[PDB]
Design an enzyme around this catalytic site. Structure first.
Site, PDB file in Angstrom:
ATOM      1  N   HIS A 108      18.320 -25.350  23.162  1.00  0.00           N
ATOM      2  CA  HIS A 108      17.734 -25.314  21.950  1.00  0.00           C
ATOM      3  C   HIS A 108      17.170 -23.974  21.829  1.00  0.00           C
ATOM      4  O   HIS A 108      17.347 -23.108  22.741  1.00  0.00           O
ATOM      5  CB  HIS A 108      16.536 -26.476  21.790  1.00  0.00           C
ATOM      6  N   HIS A 127      13.844 -21.619  19.871  1.00  0.00           N
ATOM      7  CA  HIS A 127      12.494 -21.158  19.181  1.00  0.00           C
ATOM      8  C   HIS A 127      12.568 -19.746  18.144  1.00  0.00           C
ATOM      9  O   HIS A 127      13.625 -18.957  18.456  1.00  0.00           O
ATOM     10  CB  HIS A 127      11.386 -20.858  20.217  1.00  0.00           C
ATOM     11  N   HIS A 172      10.991 -30.566  15.697  1.00  0.00           N
ATOM     12  CA  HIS A 172      10.258 -29.305  16.316  1.00  0.00           C
ATOM     13  C   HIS A 172      11.192 -28.269  16.342  1.00  0.00           C
ATOM     14  O   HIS A 172      11.099 -26.938  16.243  1.00  0.00           O
ATOM     15  CB  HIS A 172       9.538 -29.692  17.884  1.00  0.00           C
ATOM     16  N   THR A 205       7.321 -25.123  27.753  1.00  0.00           N
ATOM     17  CA  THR A 205       6.604 -24.507  26.422  1.00  0.00           C
ATOM     18  C   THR A 205       6.253 -25.406  25.461  1.00  0.00           C
ATOM     19  O   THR A 205       5.370 -24.918  24.661  1.00  0.00           O
ATOM     20  CB  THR A 205       7.240 -23.282  26.084  1.00  0.00           C
ATOM     21  N   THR A 206       6.632 -26.879  25.396  1.00  0.00           N
ATOM     22  CA  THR A 206       6.193 -27.756  24.550  1.00  0.00           C
ATOM     23  C   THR A 206       5.394 -28.771  25.213  1.00  0.00           C
ATOM     24  O   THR A 206       5.661 -28.852  26.690  1.00  0.00           O
ATOM     25  CB  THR A 206       7.253 -28.337  23.687  1.00  0.00           C
ATOM     26  N   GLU A 222       9.537 -16.475  22.678  1.00  0.00           N
ATOM     27  CA  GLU A 222       8.284 -17.298  23.321  1.00  0.00           C
ATOM     28  C   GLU A 222       7.882 -16.247  24.326  1.00  0.00           C
ATOM     29  O   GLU A 222       6.679 -15.704  24.278  1.00  0.00           O
ATOM     30  CB  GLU A 222       8.319 -18.637  23.853  1.00  0.00           C
ATOM     31  N   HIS A 270      17.209 -21.234  25.034  1.00  0.00           N
ATOM     32  CA  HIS A 270      16.754 -22.249  26.106  1.00  0.00           C
ATOM     33  C   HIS A 270      17.795 -23.080  26.643  1.00  0.00           C
ATOM     34  O   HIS A 270      17.802 -24.067  25.834  1.00  0.00           O
ATOM     35  CB  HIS A 270      15.334 -22.645  25.990  1.00  0.00           C
TER      36      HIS A 270
HETATM   37  N1  EO7 Z   1       8.281 -36.016  26.027  1.00  0.00           N
HETATM   38  C1  EO7 Z   1       8.904 -35.188  26.966  1.00  0.00           C
HETATM   39  N2  EO7 Z   1       8.845 -35.678  28.265  1.00  0.00           N
HETATM   40  C2  EO7 Z   1       9.922 -34.950  28.942  1.00  0.00           C
HETATM   41 CL1  EO7 Z   1      10.015 -35.463  30.620  1.00  0.00          CL
HETATM   42  N3  EO7 Z   1      10.657 -33.819  28.591  1.00  0.00           N
HETATM   43  C3  EO7 Z   1      10.251 -33.460  27.425  1.00  0.00           C
HETATM   44  C4  EO7 Z   1       9.687 -34.111  26.673  1.00  0.00           C
HETATM   45  N4  EO7 Z   1       9.516 -33.613  25.324  1.00  0.00           N
HETATM   46  C5  EO7 Z   1      10.258 -32.702  25.556  1.00  0.00           C
HETATM   47  N5  EO7 Z   1      10.738 -32.308  26.655  1.00  0.00           N
HETATM   48  C6  EO7 Z   1      11.604 -31.581  27.003  1.00  0.00           C
HETATM   49  O1  EO7 Z   1      11.161 -29.821  27.198  1.00  0.00           O
HETATM   50  C7  EO7 Z   1      11.804 -29.219  26.358  1.00  0.00           C
HETATM   51  C8  EO7 Z   1      10.695 -27.894  25.994  1.00  0.00           C
HETATM   52  O2  EO7 Z   1      10.395 -27.151  26.914  1.00  0.00           O
HETATM   53  S1  EO7 Z   1      11.210 -25.630  27.033  1.00  0.00           S
HETATM   54  N6  EO7 Z   1      10.803 -24.840  25.564  1.00  0.00           N
HETATM   55  O3  EO7 Z   1      12.427 -25.650  27.294  1.00  0.00           O
HETATM   56  O4  EO7 Z   1      10.358 -25.084  28.155  1.00  0.00           O
HETATM   57  C9  EO7 Z   1      12.686 -29.912  25.467  1.00  0.00           C
HETATM   58  O5  EO7 Z   1      13.552 -29.187  24.907  1.00  0.00           O
HETATM   59  C10 EO7 Z   1      12.809 -31.054  26.274  1.00  0.00           C
HETATM   60  O6  EO7 Z   1      13.919 -30.590  27.376  1.00  0.00           O
HETATM   61 ZN    ZN Z   2      11.983 -23.950  24.529  1.00  0.00          ZN
END
Ligand code: EO7
Ligand code: ZN
Ligand code: NA
EC number: 4.2.1.1
Length: 259
Positions: free
Chosen positions: A93, A95, A63, A197-198, A105, A118
């Site tokens: 990371h 986007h 991703h 946001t994911t 975003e 982020h």
């Molecule tokens: N399956 C999962 N369970 C949990 Cl618990 N956390 C998760 C996750 N998959 C992604 N994450 C986190 O979410 C951020 C993305 O979201 S963002 N763009 O920063 O808002 C990513 O980088 C990770 O840290």
């Molecule tokens: Zn992010």
């Protein structure tokens, strides 16, 4: 196991079927309307304490790419601003877009930047990241916009390792990287309560979005766009446009730290 992504068939408009919170009351990102955000004279000063940061590894997760930190102690933390207590840096990371006119975003008066960084932090009063994402104040994500102009010297170590993690599941050692080199001069920010946001889209984030973008070069961002969403040996799907669009603000107020 889930198979979300950014394509027509598995992109943001589909996420709500596996992750119904996608249509929730505090989803991110949002458009920041600069004429509706209110200066909040009571926001405390923002404190970015990255001196003892310990980076470990960089990973292509299919991703984006994550630069991971040692968060086993208070080595790199975010405090102050809208935050109560101490938030530990776990990873950063980005986007980004297929072209310089899109990629971020958050938007600012509907303006899309070429990319968004982020820096993800978790509230140490919850003990671990997995517990923190179950709390409305569990995470603080510091968001920084990227525009294309002059090169960002502090980014080049990242750009240069991307050839070694082209495809999903690849990782590389990434020690001694200093995330202070990714910051703008000003820490002026907007803040609002939101989400990841994911997927899983959890509503656990205090967003802190810096007003001042950093500049990166077209050569730097072109290298981000040579990564792959696919795994090794699979047909190439370039890792571009890995951004979620703006979500409804609903009953939320965006606060500014500056006049
Ligand atoms: N399956 C999962 N369970 C949990 Cl618990 N956390 C998760 C996750 N998959 C992604 N994450 C986190 O979410 C951020 C993305 O979201 S963002 N763009 O920063 O808002 C990513 O980088 C990770 O840290
Ligand atoms: Zn992010
Ligand atoms: Na800057």
């Amino acid at each position: 196991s889930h198979h979300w992504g950014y394509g027509k068939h598995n992109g943001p408009e589909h996420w709500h079927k596996d992750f119904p919170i996608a249509k929730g009351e505090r989803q991110s990102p949002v458009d920041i309307d600069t004429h509706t955000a209110k200066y909040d004279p009571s926001l405390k000063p923002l404190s970015v304490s990255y001196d003892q940061a310990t980076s470990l590894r960089i990973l292509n997760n299919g991703h984006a790419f994550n630069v991971e930190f040692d968060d086993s102690q208070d080595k790199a933390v975010l405090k102050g601003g809208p935050l109560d207590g101490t938030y530990r840096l776990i990873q950063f990371h980005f986007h980004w877009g297929s072209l310089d006119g899109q990629g971020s975003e958050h938007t600012v008066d509907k303006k899309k930047y070429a990319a968004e960084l982020h820096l993800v932090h978790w509230n140490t009063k919850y003990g671990d990241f997995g517990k923190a994402v179950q709390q409305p104040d569990g995470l603080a994500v510091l968001g920084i916009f990227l525009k294309v102009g002059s090169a960002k010297p502090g980014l080049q170590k990242v750009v240069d390792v991307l050839d070694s993690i082209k495809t999903k599941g690849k990782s590389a050692d990434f020690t001694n990287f200093d995330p202070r080199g990714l910051l703008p001069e000003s820490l002026d920010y907007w803040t609002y309560p939101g989400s990841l946001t994911t997927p899983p889209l959890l509503e656990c984030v205090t967003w802190i979005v810096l007003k001042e973008p950093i500049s990166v070069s077209s050569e730097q961002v072109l290298k981000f766009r040579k990564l792959n969403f696919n795994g090794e040996g699979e047909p190439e799907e370039l890792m571009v446009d890995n951004w979620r669009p703006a979500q409804p603000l609903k009953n939320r107020q965006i606060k500014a730290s500056f006049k």
